[model samples]
Target chain A: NANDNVVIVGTGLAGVEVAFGLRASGWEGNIRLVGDATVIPHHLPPLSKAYLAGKATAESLYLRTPDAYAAQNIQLLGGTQVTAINRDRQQVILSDGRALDYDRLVLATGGRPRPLPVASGAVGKANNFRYLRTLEDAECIRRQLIADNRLVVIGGGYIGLEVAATAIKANMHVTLLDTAARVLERVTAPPVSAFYEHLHREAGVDIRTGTQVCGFEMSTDQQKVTAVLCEDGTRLPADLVIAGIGLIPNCELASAAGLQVDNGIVINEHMQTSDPLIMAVGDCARFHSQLYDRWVRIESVPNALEQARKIAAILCGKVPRDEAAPWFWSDQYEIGLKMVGLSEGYDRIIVRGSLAQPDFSVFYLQGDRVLAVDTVNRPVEFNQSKQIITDRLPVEPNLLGDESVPLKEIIAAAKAELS
Target chain B: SKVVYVSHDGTRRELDVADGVSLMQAAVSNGIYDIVGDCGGSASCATCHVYVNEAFTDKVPAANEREIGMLESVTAELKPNSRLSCQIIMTPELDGIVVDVPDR
Candidate 1:
């Protein structure tokens, strides 16, 4: 009797979590999740690492089973594309010629991997050039990962590096190229970049920086890319090309529907899009945060999960908890790296633990505030750093850098000093 | 086999789990509240932490080396009976087993 019709688009982590959280929170809504992919929502992070390496299988990659959705009275419409949004009628038209009516709509159209900057018209149509954004893409890359195969990764970003690490472990020769002066230049400091550069080089990857990708050289049959052409008259023979340049939020539907769209679909603190009846989350939503005191859009599972919780609170008519600090993680060559908080405009950097060794933590501070903590193979510090950043606790560089000074002691001292 | 997840406020959800299904999989698929299991039970994330009821703690198997390392990163404190639900497999002998989710 308390049921309302709710429909969600793009069944990624954000949309799937909303469905799961709503049911778990006792929502009696008639829910339907639609996506273009034939498969159900699955974990994307493992696509470049475990799943691609054949460590995990297709069956285990899914977030939920078919029976699980049916048990919760949730309808999952796979292989269905949302063609257009009829906001006036509060409905959406599917490419399959079906119209779905909804009392409320959620837009979680996550994102697509950025293609390599080449004249390769439509990266999706290229059979040999791969991008690790979906399960199928991973499977394609994995199939070509034979011994002595050459994998030319076209970016030094997280996804690119993860795939490179996986290829190396699979006995494939890997060459990583980045346009930036150093690896991860946009997301991390020089020292952090240097650490990864050293790690990958030692792991037998030919890591190159400041390399400009001019174009692609096709094979004799013109069906596949045989090599990557560089600006400096250099050509790296590539058996398969995996590019992770970046991601652009899929906001065309929201934009065409007359909703506000900037870098992404603009939403409020409650994740409500410009339209009161519509909401957005995941990589497509850009909302202001009181915690970070800034408008940010993150393409991470944690951010998607947090946004899902926010959307759940509104739909379930409950006050959401204070926002959690945004965090991210990456697994490369047996190194479990975790980063908490957004590190932007940090004036100071402190090295915690031994940076020379594989295990370390990098703290970024802007004035007295702890901006972010990047921990490599340090789980306790990663977890504690989330709390520290969320609480906006002040930390001294000396205390933070010293491994002897326990995190608890630094946190207690910060609280005491603030009080 | 069946497993029960007792919430911090004492709400219980008992779902029938398959013999080889993981505790995290059982809770997540059944809509048991508060079990994030974010890493999909790969032992990388510790969101699937659960405290086995003291009455049946001895019957529960201990965590593996990977899980033990991940357990240290759990947001909640590690109790003597605390375990990563992902590592536990359901069996006929584990029916009616109740575990408590820690309050974050």
Candidate 2:
């Protein structure tokens, strides 16, 4: 049992956590953690917020020091790539032509930023286009965020909105263009989208909704983007362009190896892929959500951490714990947004507290059962909402909307009634 | 400032943390696995939980409303001395602070 070799690919949160988890679970097997990044594994959340705003240093972004991995007897292979998976031989071939035999393999290859279609055309020769996914990408974008520089951002998602907020705060002239009718349209309700749109607009950002980026106008030398060309006959001057449309999962290695792959590498409740010996976690893995009654590919740190811990427990011959409700949080300016559970397919949304006060929570409900919640600057409510949604608590809309009623009390009452 | 972390088995490890660096960051940088800091000190995830020594609890600044709310979600027992190490910054007054890491 001690001679078993466990190989993990990709050094994101999931990969690192899986390695740490295996060691903590008393797995004395030979552990190998591989990554393409030359630097030690670091956290990605701050890359857009504090790191971009100059509040956090590069050293502070590291998840763990090199000494930690060495102390745990885990091989931290940075600047290395796993080119192919030889399942028959239980081996993974590296780019350097090294073959490592594994008793179990874990794929934590996280997603990359979805590139902007129009910008990738001929005009993409201009070096002003950027996307945020890795530390290097963020550093490159940070260097170009000069005061008074024109920054044209595409996509109204969390990444784009956060960058726009950071840029606006840095005194950069920012124009945000989104194809949807409002910002965060896919993940959030209309009211929440409107709130963010208003927040960005108030911060001196030029937000253009329902706008399509047709192409880019470049300089004569084609080394610089002069302006952004839109489908509506609009040309916006820009010195830099950042597109944060979405993420495309990195499941090519798994798919090519004859393993299951959908929007991500399909995994089971145990985080195991089509091959029992091979498991996938993080943004690259899609698993069936018993709570949601469907397949879900979560792109959040919490999900990654949860899956990694579960895989370690299962591998160590321990029964994995129950799944936790999916949750995510984002920070833009002074506003803090924390969301819990999936709010899709909800028939009603109840607004609690005052949006005018810039502190409120939106409850997504399907009839009397709570589906999800999006809380802004309301951490207490957000905390309570997690339990409510997880327990499928039923509550009256009036009580939820009424500021006089305490959420804790409401939860207590609901639980008592269930008995 | 030097900070000491006491593990569940009563083993004490001390590290010198720089000013403006959170206790959680120092613990994590020094390979203290107990302090996860999963949310990176955003007061969102309660992974970086710690119990301030009784004598130094008042010396440290009180947990804010957001921090208090997050503490409720911690897996360990929520004691009055409980605080997220990420919310506690290394300061001159708290030069030799000691905290107990709960067994999760």
Candidate 3:
């Protein structure tokens, strides 16, 4: 008898990587990649940056060419939506109403971008407010970027700032209005955000902080946004408006199926939903972190890749390398920003190299030990931030704060203890 | 002398005026700048997106939130010490605020 097949859902990063891992691990059976988005499986992070900047071509992101899938002996069910799962019978109800049987079902349903909770089920004046999530969303925004037009971004998060920076490049005047005192207040450490705040203003963005939108003042016809009405009585003109306000997990089906739902679909160490046969990964699956033993929902490429690898490892009966540090990246103009690990409650920030020059790194710390890092252009520090997060290593506090001392010294000293 | 030389881009470059006063006046009166304001003098836009002499980088009092945000978006590239010129508010402490333009 032969082994039963593995059915992975969503043809995004997690699903594509999982399907690839299965084949690499010598799984010699049927493997199906299911997703709803019509676009071919592609890396999505660049959609907000290089893709929009016209630096990344469509060919650069397509995860696999038709021949690549054929050479790997994999079946890709692109644009296929899985509507239901009969756990008892181990079958999937596709949008077309076809029940496909599977031995192991993987749910990489991903996430959906969140919108303003304002103006729900109510009649109100229409205004121009867009978002940056999918390729279609980018296409829609590209139309508004005129040479002399003024671009207003509501949120000062990386997405907001990135959008503002890009608009400047297109010869548009940009005004970034952030509700907080600086950009991305709730998510990042103060020092990390401060660096970004300065970067935006220097790039010619007129930043308005500690402000709130009272909705746009529409024309007499109640259609076009005539003026940006602010609560503080500051009237700002806007040619166009957009938001980069984060996302929400698509856990509607899991919650409907009567599984545990906190912020997302609850799962355990083994990617085990309540039903052992059906496992979830990526943004939809909010599992307990084995490393910290706390409930954390990390949405990043590394996290999704880790979850996929872990699920594949269990299915293959092998040990998983799921302990890599969580990381994210952002782009605003020429700077390529990389962040490794979470720096939420980091107590201190160690600045290395000359701040006068735009090539320093900020090492986030919890008193004596390293937490995460906001590495600006230094690759070595960016790489070290990952090691510190994975191993929970203690870097010399004095050394990190001083550019004169080498980062290699801290790593060598830290590694000697581990070895 | 009226214009603050924000030591950004590896060398001190004069900033475009903000609100009529030199970029230095916008930095100090409102808040901070690239160079430290030990003397509590004139302020600039604090987007001291410039590179002054290395020794002058030591004279700055470091950036606050508003300053940092402006720094993050500028640059030939982004880096750590990108301070708001308002904090530095050029006095004798920093005849010129040296900013390091991120490496090419």
Candidate 4:
């Protein structure tokens, strides 16, 4: 029915979780789910590790099995688009000319992986190179990996790192060429960055950090990419070239509907946009994060689901999911990195575990209150840090230094004081 | 019906599980304390991490490459006993499997 109480866009993490969260929070109203994807909300972190490693399959990617959605009576609309949102009539116009009237709308529309420009030189003058984002994209690369091919990755971000690491497992000579001075330079400090650079090099990856290419020199037939032309006047020979640049928010629909869009459609604390009735969550919208005390727009499955759950609560008139600290995680080259809180301008980092070892965590601190903790291979500490960040409780800097006191205790103490 | 003895909150409770079901699922469905199977059996998450008893470890299936690699990175130690609970599928022979709960 077009007169549904809730209409969620995007079937990624944000969309699927919100639908279930709505029912869980006792929103006994009509719910309509719309997305171009056929599966349930999929968590993309695995696309590099478990998914690519063949530890899990596409079938397991479903956050909610089909049966569960049916049990909840959430109408699952796949391969459809909400083209025009008629806020005046309190409805969304679908591409098929169907208008869904909704009391509350959730924009979980996620961001798309950035497109590659041939100027990166990774393409090697051929369009054969592909960026790994969707399951189909990974599978396409996988078929090539089976053909005993050489994969040349152009960026050193998380996506490129994961694929390169997985390609090594597939017995492929994976060379990651990044124009940046260091791999993952933007995400980490010098030590962390150097560690991954060394690890990948040790793992038999051709780490060409601080190297740039001018363009791709392709075959005369244009059927295949031949070589990458370097700005330093060297040619990098390759069969397949992939560029892992960055991502941009997929907020075109919102913009077409007259919603303001900058980095993303800005929303307030209530997850409400300018329209008031419609709210945007996940990578499609930027919202003021009370935890970081600023606006944050991110493209992570956890962030999407977390924001979706929060909007679901507000729609259901329950406490928003913000009560729990927002957290995110990533897996690359045998390292499990979990990040909690915002590190936009953190001044100091308290080292929790040893950097020399395989397991360690960095507590990004802004003054006394712990802002964010990035733990490598330490889920227990990461889990504990999530609660601590939400409480915004001050821990004895010395106690944190000693590592004897657990982070959860600080939250427990803060909550006790409140009671 | 298999009785997998699971420990949660320092108390071991016997749960009736299916041969194909996961130990984490047994704990979550039976309300066996603290086991929140966040990824729903997809082995994509480490929420169901646990320490398997030596005697019962043989009854469980061997961990696959991807699952073992994930468990090795996220879980605390590689003690012969350390196994991600979600990686262990239940069986009649694995009934009465005693597992230790991790301290929060």
Candidate 5:
């Protein structure tokens, strides 16, 4: 079994981690990583932040160097994609007309940015209309961040806010439009959203909310977007536009191959798909969370790395550790926001520290149980909340809100009482 | 420039790391699995904690405000020389730097 071939598709963080993690887990089987991108595997979080602001170089974006893959004997097939999967024959047909037989297959095909419905027809023609998904996209967007350039960003999610902040920092004129009543409406509480909106406004960004972009005005040559047309009869002229609507999981291959596909490729707690020999990880994989008692598709780097390790452990005949609480972080301007756990179905929220201050934390609670915590410039609280959420520890609102009561002391006391 | 990484079990591995690359990145690239660098050198995560050898500790740059705050979250024992490897970029002056990986 150690000699069996393990073929992994898509060379994002998840796929690359699985290959490297397998070797670290003492697997000697042949490992091949296939990716459609011509470039080596790279990190994505920096794309909207450091990379866009010209703080990080393209070379630094790489997850690992070429020599690293060669040293580990990880056959990296860049610029190639697996077109079809043959379950019965235990092989995958590559776009290059090659068949790779695998005893075990891993799917890490990540998601792509959701295109703006109104801008779909104008996207390809207009060089100014862009989406931040690939390195090339970031490179193009970076060039458009010239000082005084009019940049209109669609959507108010993390990507949009980060990109707007980067552009604004570059001295560009940025106008962010969000259909929701508040920014980050789907993810954070109203206070967090208001805090970010205020942060961007204070940093000199034109923030628009409860606004709808119905269409766009095109150039005479039809090769550029001249302006963004709103449903309220307002037309905002734009030198460049970027859409960060959302992401659509790349599950076509798996779905066409007859695997269970929901919003993402459905997998079990062990990251194994319906087929025992195949596994899935990262944004493309939706797995059941024992901690949250729900099925979820996490798009964070930590989730990808965690799932990869679980798959590696299961493949190497080792029992995987209990799933840790899901966590994510975002950086906009000088503020670092760290969030742990899912706040869905929460009945109450506890605010520790004042939101007016630069540093504070908001804890989401369902009755007395901790559901999630969002900390801004408060890593100590963020770090403590991870364990609190993982252990499903309950805390008194007064203690959580009191800065004098250390989160560590509360955690220890709670655990002691549980025993 | 060559940098040295000492594992928790006292195993030493020297690496030819390029200038400008973070020590955490060099360690992870070369299969030094202990340095997770989970946040990709952002200093948001303290998973890449390492203790600089006292001899070269002065050569390394001091941790920034954010890095210092994140260091509080490190699971391992905090020491005077403790630093996040992601915050320590490799440079000619710090070529022979030696960092010890702590057991998390």
Candidate 6:
């Protein structure tokens, strides 16, 4: 009953979505889902949050149960490494001396956590240094979040802050270090940054800004970490260290195969790469957005799932449209932050509600059109605002700031004007 | 122990759910379509949206402010009996609760 083989690399959500989509669209091919890890695809967003805090079990984290794969007849290849992609042969050579023949290939290898330079003292240490991108990474960090252990986080990005909150909640002494003058300087707005800084401080996290992790102090045997050495020549005691610097896309195989590689594996609207037969998705693929009129690389769950659907539609001969507006969510200290659209070039920001309260949203406006909306503890704005971003809805600054006016009405008015 | 899900397509399923588990958890464990529970009962994603049978509306508590915020953004149409499946837990008094999954 097996037809041609459609091979997917990396068993992340994007990969899982594509495989499931293909079957839904009546893909009769032998679908093979492969990953280097022994585990299947899982709900990754909970890793630094609920999973680390021990709120979610391993079963709840899986994207699909093992039995579901067998029911769907998907060839689940876990713990298998794809070392090279031989485009001419239409084969993916494995590290274990096997080759997977493919009629079409999808690279959803996602990304690996960016690590400290090898020259740093922490790199060679046998223990106490970790970066959390995988389940194993989180489990390692979880083991160290004991009652009295001190954790020195090397970056103040979202992952770092999330882990810091989890550690603090577990009754650990935590210090968050960031070289930037403020936390989340690169991503979130200044006001939002200040809000989180305030929140973390109140949550009992020792947050240090304008600080750099120059190196580390190891034990006498050099087998364990004991402290962190700062750029200002200060040493802070630490029983453990968590480095959440960032993620680097895993695109080496695509590059070696001579496919177009930009900031990531450059793909078309259909999620097809330079080689039409090969495709890419998730954090590993960087495609141009006709809507934004620019090339972008997004690292969010919705974007990943959407791209997978697009690829499935393409393989099924269906033209995909809408190109859903990008969105993301984060949870920390009981605060749920949901964001929609891009705010990179916004010229105006209107606050819809008081940030001091439990619920509020900051609207980013580029001229009259809504560019992005960031909401804290307010999912109403997060859900309705996606259509506004997609429609490029224009709004009066006054009506936007007025919390009395229903947000749906503003979107309806914009839709009316278009008609 | 009984929770019924009528999918958007009108596919009916009766599941034997555990006591004290959220409706979302029961739907997910039973492989009921259209309930993601992505935020894991934190009521953040609203993917676990469902419409409780009108008869059970009063039996369920009114949504709090946080739940109301999340419910407003769901892609599905809202009704008086709509509730986040993650927020509803099973109780012996509310046995045989039936709900409908919304259209995307």
Best by TM-score: 2
Candidate 4 local lDDT, A306-380, one digit each (tens): 677677668767766554466666677667777777676767778866788778878777777677777888766
The candidate maximizing DockQ is 2
What is candidate 6's lDDT per residue for A234-320, written digit by digit as tens? Answer: 898999888888889999999999998987899987788989889999999998876577898999888887898788888887778
- The two-chain DockQ for each candidate, comma-separated, is 0.42, 0.62, 0.01, 0.10, 0.53, 0.35
Models 1 onward score TM values of 0.93, 0.96, 0.75, 0.80, 0.95, 0.92
Backbone clashes for every candidate come to 0, 0, 63, 1, 0, 0
Q: Write the residue-wise lDDT of candidate 2 on A191-250 in tens digits.
A: 898899889898999999999999888888778888998999999999998889999999
- Cα deviation of A196, candidate 2, in Å: 1.0
> What does candidate 1's lDDT look like per residue over A1-419, in tens digits?
26688899989889988988877676797999999988877788889878888986676676876678888888999999998999989999999899999988999998877666583664435677887788788888888998898989988789889988999998999999999999999889999999999999999999989998898888767778888889999999988888889898999999999999998999998889888999999999998877668888989888898889888888888898788888888999989888998888889888987779989999988887788889898776777787687777776667887778888688778878865
Off by over 4 Å in 3: A119-128, A217-226, A354-356, B1-104
For model 2, the stretches where C-alpha displacement exceeds 4 angstroms are A394-397
Per-model C-alpha RMSD: 2.6, 1.6, 16.2, 6.5, 1.9, 2.6
Candidate 4 residues lying further than 4 Å off, grouped into runs, are: A1-4, A39-41, A119-128, A403-419, B1-88, B92-104
Q: Return the TM-score for candidate 5, rounded to 2 decimals.
A: 0.95
Q: Is the docking of candidate 5 incorrect, acceptable, medium or high quality?
A: medium
- CAPRI class assigned to model 4: incorrect
lDDT of 3 at A143: 64
Task: For residues A240-290, write the lDDT of model 3, one tens digit per residue.
Answer: 777776778887767766667888888888887888877889888887775
Instruction: Give the C-alpha miss distance for residue A57 in model 3, angstroms.
Output: 1.4
Over B1-104, each residue of candidate 1 has an lDDT whose tens digit, in order, gives: 87888875777777887587688977775566578786566566689999998777876777766677667767798987888898888889888888888885
TM-scores of the first chain across all predictions?
0.97, 0.97, 0.91, 0.90, 0.98, 0.96
* Candidate 6: residue B2 lDDT (0-100): 88
* B1-104: candidate 2 lDDT, tens digit per residue: 89999965678888887788899988876667666776667777788899998879997879988788889878899999999999998998888899989886
Best by lDDT: 5
Residue A401 lDDT (model 6): 89
